[PDB]
């Protein structure tokens, strides 16, 4: 009642964007990404590091918002965290 | 139904390895 009222759901374009920002993120930060996904989605606890799937359709706006918040804080600041 | 951007990525360092 509070969460979704503050954090509106990501549209398809947004979800594509988030798919693109996550893909621009390096291994280091991917650890935080998968941490946010896994910790918000306990059903996805079996996210094998060799084969991590991102299914935004099960991801709550909560996760989608925290993810976007993080990916942007990384890429908008450092478009290339690696050299 | 709708073909959505389902992502797959490999993450270095298996910190989350179940036992």
UniProtKB/Swiss-Prot annotation, chain A:
Family note: Belongs to the BET family.
Tissue occurrence: Ubiquitously expressed.
Residues bearing PTM Phosphoserine: 1
Disulfide cross-links: none
Subcellular location: Nucleus; Chromosome
Domain NET, residue spans: 1-82
Known partners and oligomeric status: Interacts with p53/TP53; the interaction is direct. Interacts (via CTD region) with CDK9 and CCNT1, acting as an associated component of P-TEFb complex. Interacts with RELA (when acetylated at 'Lys-310'). Interacts (via NET domain) with NSD3, CHD4, BICRA and ATAD5. The interaction with BICRA bridges BRD4 to the GBAF complex. Interacts (via NET domain) with JMJD6 (via JmjC and N-terminal domains); the interaction is stronger in presence of ssRNA and recruits JMJD6 on distal enhancers. Interacts with NSD3. Interacts with NIPBL. (Microbial infection) Interacts with bovine papillomavirus type 1 regulatory protein E2. This interactions may serve for the tethering of viral genomes to host mitotic chromosomes allowing successful partitioning of the viral genome during cell division.
Described purpose of this protein according to its UniProt entry: Chromatin reader protein that recognizes and binds acetylated histones and plays a key role in transmission of epigenetic memory across cell divisions and transcription regulation. Remains associated with acetylated chromatin throughout the entire cell cycle and provides epigenetic memory for postmitotic G1 gene transcription by preserving acetylated chromatin status and maintaining high-order chromatin structure. During interphase, plays a key role in regulating the transcription of signal-inducible genes by associating with the P-TEFb complex and recruiting it to promoters.
Biased segments, Basic and acidic residues type: 5-15
Other remarks in the entry: JQ1, a thieno-triazolo-1,4-diazepine derivative, and I-BET, a benzodiazepine derivative, have been tested on tumors with success. Treatment with GSK1210151A (I-BET151, a I-BET derivative) has strong effets on mixed lineage leukemia and promotes myeloid differentiation and leukemia stem-cell depletion.
Illness the protein is tied to: Cornelia de Lange syndrome 6: A form of Cornelia de Lange syndrome, a clinically heterogeneous developmental disorder associated with malformations affecting multiple systems. It is characterized by facial dysmorphisms, abnormal hands and feet, growth delay, cognitive retardation, hirsutism, gastroesophageal dysfunction and cardiac, ophthalmologic and genitourinary anomalies. CDLS6 inheritance is autosomal dominant.
Superkingdom of the source species: Eukaryota
Record protein name field: Bromodomain-containing protein 4
Site of covalent link Glycyl lysine isopeptide (Lys-Gly) (interchain with G-Cter in SUMO2): 45
Lineage of producing organism: Eukaryota, Metazoa, Chordata, Craniata, Vertebrata
Domain comment, as recorded: The NET domain mediates interaction with a number of chromatin proteins involved in transcription regulation (NSD3, JMJD6, CHD4, GLTSCR1 and ATAD5). The C-terminal (CTD) region mediates interaction and recruitment of CDK9 and CCNT1 subunits of the P-TEFb complex. It is also required for maintenance of higher-order chromatin structure.
Post-translational modification: Phosphorylation by CK2 disrupt the intramolecular binding between the bromo domain 2 and the NPS region and promotes binding between the NPS and the BID regions, leading to activate the protein and promote binding to acetylated histones. In absence of phosphorylation, BRD4 does not localize to p53/TP53 target gene promoters, phosphorylation promoting recruitment to p53/TP53 target promoters.
């Amino acid at each position: 009642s509070e969460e979704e009222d503050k954090c509106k759901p990501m549209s398809y374009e947004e979800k594509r964007q988030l798919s693109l920002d996550i893909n621009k993120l390096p291994g280091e930060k991917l650890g935080r990404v998968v941490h946010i996904i896994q910790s918000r989605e306990p059903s996805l606890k079996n996210s094998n590091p060799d084969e991590i799937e991102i299914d935004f359709e099960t991801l709550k706006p909560s996760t989608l918002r925290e993810l976007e918040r993080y990916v942007t804080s990384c890429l908008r600041k450092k478009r290339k965290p690696q050299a | 139904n709708l073909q959505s951007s389902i992502v797959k990525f490999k993450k270095p360092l298996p910190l989350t390895q179940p036992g």
